[PDB]
Design a protein around this nucleic acid. Sequence first.
RNA 1: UUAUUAUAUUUAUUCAUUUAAGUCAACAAUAUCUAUUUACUGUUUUUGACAACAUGAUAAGGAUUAUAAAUGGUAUUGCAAAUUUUAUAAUCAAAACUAAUUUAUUAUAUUAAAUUAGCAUGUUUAGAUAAAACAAUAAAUUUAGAAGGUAUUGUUGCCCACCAUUCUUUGUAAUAAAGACAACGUGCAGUAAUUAAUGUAUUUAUAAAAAUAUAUUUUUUUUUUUU
Lengths: 154, 44, 809, 41, 70, 142, 139, 84, 147, 48, 141
Amino acid sequence: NTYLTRSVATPPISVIRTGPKWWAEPERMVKHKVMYFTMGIDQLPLRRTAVIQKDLKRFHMCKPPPRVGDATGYKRSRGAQLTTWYRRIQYQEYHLQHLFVRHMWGLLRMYPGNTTKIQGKADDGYVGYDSVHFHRYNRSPLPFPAREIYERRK
Amino acid sequence: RRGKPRPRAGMFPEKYRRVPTLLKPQQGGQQYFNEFLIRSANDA
Amino acid sequence: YYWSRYRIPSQMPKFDGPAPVAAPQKTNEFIDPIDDKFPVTIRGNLVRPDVPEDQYVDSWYVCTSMTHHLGDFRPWSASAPANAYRFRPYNEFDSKGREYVEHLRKYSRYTPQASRGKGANGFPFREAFLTKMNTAETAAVNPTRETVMTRAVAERLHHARVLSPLEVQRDVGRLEEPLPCAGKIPAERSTFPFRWNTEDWYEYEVAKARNKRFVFENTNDNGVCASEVTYRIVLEGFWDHHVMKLADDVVMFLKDVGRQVVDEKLKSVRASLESLSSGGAVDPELVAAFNASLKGPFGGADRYDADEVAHFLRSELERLEEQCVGLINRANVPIPGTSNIYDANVSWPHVEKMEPWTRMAEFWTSSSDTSFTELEMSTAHYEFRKYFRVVVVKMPFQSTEFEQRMYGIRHWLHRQTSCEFHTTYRRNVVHDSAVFPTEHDPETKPSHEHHRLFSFALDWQSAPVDYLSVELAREGDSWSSLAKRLGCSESELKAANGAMEEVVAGVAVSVPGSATRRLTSFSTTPSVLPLQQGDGKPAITSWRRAAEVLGCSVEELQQANGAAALTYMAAAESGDGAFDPAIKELVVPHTATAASPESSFAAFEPVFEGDTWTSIAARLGCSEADLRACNDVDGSVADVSSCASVSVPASATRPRRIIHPQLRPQAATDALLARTLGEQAVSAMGDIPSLPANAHKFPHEYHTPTSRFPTTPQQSPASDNWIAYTAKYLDKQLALQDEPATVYNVNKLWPMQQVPGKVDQTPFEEDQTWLMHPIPVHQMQQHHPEKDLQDLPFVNHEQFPRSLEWTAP
Amino acid sequence: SIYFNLNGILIWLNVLHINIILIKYAFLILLNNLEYLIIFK
Amino acid sequence: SEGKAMPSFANEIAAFACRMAVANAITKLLPLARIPLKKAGLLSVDRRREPGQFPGFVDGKKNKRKFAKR
Amino acid sequence: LKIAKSTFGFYLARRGQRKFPFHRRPHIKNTQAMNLNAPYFWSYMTAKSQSFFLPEENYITGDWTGKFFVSKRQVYTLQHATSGGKVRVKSFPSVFELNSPSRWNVGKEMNTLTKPRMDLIDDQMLTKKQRLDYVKAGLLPK
Amino acid sequence: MHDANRFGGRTAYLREIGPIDHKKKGRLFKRDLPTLQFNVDVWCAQQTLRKQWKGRDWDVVEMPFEMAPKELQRVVPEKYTDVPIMTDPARHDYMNIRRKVFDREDMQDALFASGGAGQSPYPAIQRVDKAAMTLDKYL
Amino acid sequence: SIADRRHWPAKKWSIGLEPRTPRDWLRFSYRNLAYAYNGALRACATFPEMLVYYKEMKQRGVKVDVDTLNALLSRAARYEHIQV
Amino acid sequence: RQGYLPRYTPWEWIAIQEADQPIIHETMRTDNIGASYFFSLNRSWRYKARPHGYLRNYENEVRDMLQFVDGVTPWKQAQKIRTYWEVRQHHPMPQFNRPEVAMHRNSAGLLPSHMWEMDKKTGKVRAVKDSVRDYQTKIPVPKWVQL
Amino acid sequence: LGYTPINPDTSPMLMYSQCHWHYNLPQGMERPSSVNRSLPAPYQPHHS
Amino acid sequence: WAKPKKRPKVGPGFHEKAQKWRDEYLLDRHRVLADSLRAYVDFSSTKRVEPWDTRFAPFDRVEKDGVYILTRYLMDDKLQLCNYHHRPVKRMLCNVGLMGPQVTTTARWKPYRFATNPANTTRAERTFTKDKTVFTGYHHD
RNA sequence: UUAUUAUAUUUAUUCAUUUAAGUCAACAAUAUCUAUUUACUGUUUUUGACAACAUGAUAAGGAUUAUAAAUGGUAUUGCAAAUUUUAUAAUCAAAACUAAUUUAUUAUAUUAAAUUAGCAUGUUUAGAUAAAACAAUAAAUUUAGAAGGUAUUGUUGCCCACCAUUCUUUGUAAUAAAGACAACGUGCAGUAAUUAAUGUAUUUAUAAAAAUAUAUUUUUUUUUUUU
């Protein structure tokens, strides 16, 4: 990972909401596709998410279905449970993409950015070459140079 | 600055009022209608 | 009164009425109350009558549209021929469809001639020509094994014809409408599509942008753009419809004067030809000029009879007629019914459009101090504009009576419309070799040392080079002996100096114009004036007798003799101990010195490997019998690489000069810099340092203006390539110190021709070398020699508002 | 001095507007700010 | 590329301009191919326009400046 | 201006926090004249080449009765530091002189010598309002 | 913006790291765009200039006209000064002359007339036999 | 200046109405006129009047259609006084 | 009064306007002699061929400038103009490398350590002594300078 | 509308008022001015 | 208009506080100069921490192998002479050209002020606590 | 909440700059019939546009009139046309912040030429807060159509009591009553008005008044003709 400077986190929905802007950026989901593909891992959630966006992108132009008065509200309820499902589908995938990649860097030995956790290789947050005295969250004064978690040889 | 609250969505003009009515929604795949009417005429 | 005009002449309408129906009873008055409530389904979405847009002129200060026709409206019918599909001039294609079919038809006729002389128009279709340039992919991929199969199975096996999509009867009703008449066009890889080469595509698009001006229209052709002089008039009015209606006017003006004026010459031309109509009866002078040539067309020295001369003349008037009458015809075509000025083939002259000039002038409409957002948010863009139309008149001959009809157009132009004329007239120019001689190189080739700054000021006497035309016959020279030293023909010398029938030693012969051995009118080797006897035994002791002895100015004597000038009269402090030269031997001013055929011409001409004895004399111009004799004949040219040039023969030679004659001599620059060359010998300025001592240790902070980045390091001793390096450091025993490079020069720095002998640097191939070298970044403000006048990108000063595509002829 | 019939005169002095009409669509819409702004039509 | 020439056309806002340019092209070549195209909108042209430059907006497109109350 | 600090307050308006183009800020406020970056001590706010000739203000064109102060673009030389005579540079409030000469000043223009924004501020020059604003700032506390 | 992984890292020339005091710290030229923009135009031009000069498989070598290749035995108009000159239309050889490269082994005649044992510059070209049987011909 | 401003009336023909503005050329084509006529032919009661349309649609090149064949030929048989 | 405004300026007013203003004698453009390469561009200082534009154009004039600045100026007076490095030769640290390239090249030998004083505890420069009095340099004005 | 007078040669509101042409009208030449050729004056210079 | 209201006089006798203050400040200007100049120079003579980032290839390879070989043998004395500043070494290392173009593209390097730490800078607290008395533009140490 | 149509909707935030006065009128030199005109001399009485007061005048600002080519306003923003009656204040080179009305560049590569910015490293982290619906892509948690004002360019509108001088005046009840009136302080009582008001009765009290009990509308409306 060539990006190592400090970062800023945004909640899943606040990124999922951007849709084809960054979340469903065509080439991005092609990236995490191949990465999933090559690892022998089935790309089920991505293709599960891919159809979600592809339909939303295709139909982002139209009006919402005419809100005729329904005292039952089943249509408004179905309009919500089907939505929160879609969010929950992307919620899993959004986390899933961050799950493998940090673990993937455990296999390529690429030091992720600051305040980043790889499940086994960097159990707590790794921070090297920051702009501050200490580990930003654990208040541990950094070691110089940036501490290394992998073994030196390739 | 506004300094007043944000207006609702309906009072704002239509978000895509410029795209032609033909495109929302895009009736894609007109190619297939002639294929589907045939197979449907087949079974019927 | 200056105001008596501004009163009103009639009685204005009077106020006796109520408020019109439903108007003021918030409500913005501008919107018609009832008319706008009229449903669009019934009246449409139109605001101004549905007529061809060009009628409307964008109004000023009154936010609406107004017709340049005074309230009249021409329907769409007038904008097209009879019954035109979609109201087009031609039924076949739209704007774009007629834009690109033009080229595809224009490339079908492109031949290397069509480009030369013509500017951007001469360029072929950018695509049809660039893909042709790509014969890499051009290899015509035959229809794949599958296609020829899927068809063969279709055409024969399944008993079914296969049809191409154009020929497919997509019709549901009219399956008897034929395929397009070209259903069998051949598809190749070269022509279509246009997949072209990248770097070449640059070279085309760039060369197109620069060669816009290089149109040579004054030709001798017979075509819609053949002419002797091409005047272009660029009218300039603030309103489009102004300039158009004007560009229409001058046409029906120049069509009148142009038709008449050219007609009189046509009345003259047919007069200058016929059976008992002579006028081209050749001048005895003209029939001489055709026969004023030493060597003509067919055998030796030539002679034309007056007849074929009178034929050559008629051989040309036939063209000045065909170009004349071809003009009158294109003058009479445009009628008020079918006036089309914008086509050269139909109308004469033919107005050519030109992009209007537009200068957006945005500014803060507000004016207040506390709030800046108030200002910026209050920006409003009002534009200045000027519309141009260019009238292109092509006269097959330059009549000054017509031109002075033209330069009088500026008077009666329509209001607020200035015009500029672009005259383009052929002009006969004499390249007389007598003044500019195509002679050999100077023996001492000038170098970059002669092209620093201010070299034009101090290094070159402005061309043409001065040459002596006056030569004094020496003590016993003859006519062949003078023609010798002047390298000219004795007969030419006899003709040159009419008054000189007998040569009297001491009179100056007028050097012939055709001479080849004339001198640079000055002497190069410095001369000194000793206080040796001179005038009597008494020597020079004052400024005036200093001039009297040399016979030149006291001033020009001071200019070269700077040190002697700063001290005294004739440098009164004479020589003691060791003779004081500038005092004793005053350097004669370069101007007071006369050249010599010895010093002027190098008497040493080199020899090359392919040279033979006569071959060198063939280059030098002399004879072998003159060369070999003057050179103490050798068994072979191999020994001496520089055989001395022949002591000039009687007829001529082409010998190299000792030094470039145009080069401004240093002695003159000594004269120009008199005082400063004085204050060297005066105060004994040994030497002045330019940089402090330790500079070579400190590489950067001493970066003089003439110095440039990226700095060229010291060259590795001979590491020109890998063998040069390997043989030098890794494998000393290797035989090939350097692989055999080209015997001819190898300029790796292409195409930037760099000064020779200078340790030079090849552009960095690997990025790592590009970033790490010390290169400054543009911290301070940006400056450029040309557009520093146009101070910023925002404020673009225009001394004159001209169309941004205004091409100076 | 040429002329062609009027449609509405509009004396827009700084005091007020007085917009008379004799309706048509339009042609050239004249303008004078000698002292009193008027929009001839 | 008749319009403002750019290095890379890798954006749909350009692709549609090409998708339309090819659509109109087929129709001129083949008459009755206009029926299945027009019913699917490939012939129809967008009137969408990215906002032209303007100094008032800080970025220049649609976001105004700041103003704080006293 | 709200507070006319000189004759040019009555005329020109602040126009808000207007953003002039780079290097075209109208008033030549060299408040960054003396910002000592020791490595670039010979290149900062100096002649970009060290083979230029000295500016004009270090020299005397003609027979002068006498300059009240020599301009601030003048560069300091050893002759300046050794002759020791009163050398004056214009600044607020009245004028500044180099009474205590040194050789650490030789070679740098007077721009880099003087301190434009004198840290000691005037509770006298600023009305009760403009002083109050310094009190809140902590530059002139209370 | 100036995230150091932008512009091939050369953005490090334009970056004021940390909580800068906008008034006193931070170089001026790093603020105005066109200077930042003009600078990137420099570096971005270098990569082109680099790549154009990394593909210099050919080396420029002058040659008297008489023994030059028969391709350039005609008038050769300078670049950017005429419509690109296809080499030979009649010979069906439509390749830009500025783009046609001639092989050093082809021209050891004049360029290395000093070759002595003419191979000593370089051995001759082994041209492939495009006619006799080979795997391409199923044989 | 007189010959221009003549607006030769669009109703030069039957049901097919001529265009005279560029926006009107958008809603017009010699192909689609067959639709208008086949809509009128099938509205004609008797064969004889169905001539004046076909007789016309042959004058200006309004290309016929399949249903144009039906509308004529179907009623060609049903017109009693027809000769075969 | 009746709208008949001329679409074209009538032929009459053409002649009447075109005869009120005189022909420029120069636009006649007649030349059968040729161009005078030696003399034409060197004509008298009144009507001379006046160069204009970029400084390159002033060939025959720059030469006069040099001849002029050579004339009035005595070298005596011009001697006093000092280059910057001529002045910086008197500074305690006249020449030391800047960080871009030769930062490592700088050494303590470049330090004028004797000018100031160091304190061992702080490791810094506590003050500096007076350099104007004790700077005895044989070249207050440089060597080749001779008033 | 002030002390600074309006330049009558460059103002549209003047030049395109009714007391002069409008930019729409045929814009031809109003009247040919034969001054120098009907009553010409002779050349009495002040510079000798 | 907020009609431009005058500022009062500069105060009585402040000029004397001016000629004084500017002068003896310009005297302080010397010592901060003399201090920082030494700090800059003596920084240039010292050793730095190695500019490369060991985390990224080709500097993850063990000291025995990899580009550390050429670092240890072909140029070892040189890289000590250049005092391991991040400007010369990346220029020296690019000259040897035996690692190709992997200086800029592959090999990632420490940030600027992380590479001006002198040798034996163990505690990371150090790189931010460089002295404030010196005015150097963070070249000092 | 009445029977062609959507707000819930990200992307941002530490920003400053100004100097050292000078208007009381016009004057061909070349090539057209000659003027020294060459070097055309005649001595001096006023106070607006200013450093000051001195009428007009165009902007910023979104909130309910497009389906077949348009998202920025008039009430007014420094220098403008009739009010003068202390006064030179204008850009020139080298020059000093206190200012509401502002994108500053955040860690592969970093000062080349009119002089141009060295301390603020600390979890893109307080409270406040900024701006989009336009060639792009978010189309719904939902809309005309009934309603009041003590104000009277109208809520930043008025009003109200206690709390001081006063003054006036008495039928002298804590600490006289009434009327006048403009301070300060305390709320914020009233205009359906922040728990509707009014009235009457009981009680309560910084003060407008509050709680309880009844009428009541000078309060605004919500409306089943035997399920």
